[PDB]
Ligand SMILES: *[C@@H]1O[C@H](CO)[C@@H](O)[C@H](O)[C@H]1NC(C)=O
């Protein structure tokens with residue numbers, strides 16, 4: 001969290017079922033949009049940080 | 051946080067239609083019977099006025 005790495009997403013077919021596969025995953029709440037709308041929604045220049 | 055708004059709707063309502071149902075979302079193929087998780091969430095979301 002001190003030195004957070006950033007990465008940019010493009011030309012991506014994003015399926016979030018694989019995220020639902022992992023039992024340890026416990027945070028799916030989205031500050032942006034409803035998770036159901038997330039599957040239907042499309043974006044550009046998607047930006048992720050870890 | 052007493053005020054609440056419905057985050058999840060199964061089917062878009064009719065004109066002048068009302069929904070009072072409070073059931074955890076069943077988007078998961080497995081029934082989310084009293085279980086809130088991946089593709090499962092009760093439709094109510096707190097307004098949480100600040
Ligand atoms: C589903 O989740 C399990 C549990 O981690 C994982 O091993 C598997 O690769 C995932 N995908 C499929 C297609 O089963």
Ligand SMILES: *[C@@H]1O[C@H](CO)[C@@H](O)[C@H](O)[C@H]1NC(C)=O
Pocket residue numbers: 018019021022
């Ligand atoms: C990590 O890799 C496995 C392949 O063994 C695959 O199921 C998926 O990409 C990841 N596993 C998860 C998310 O459970």
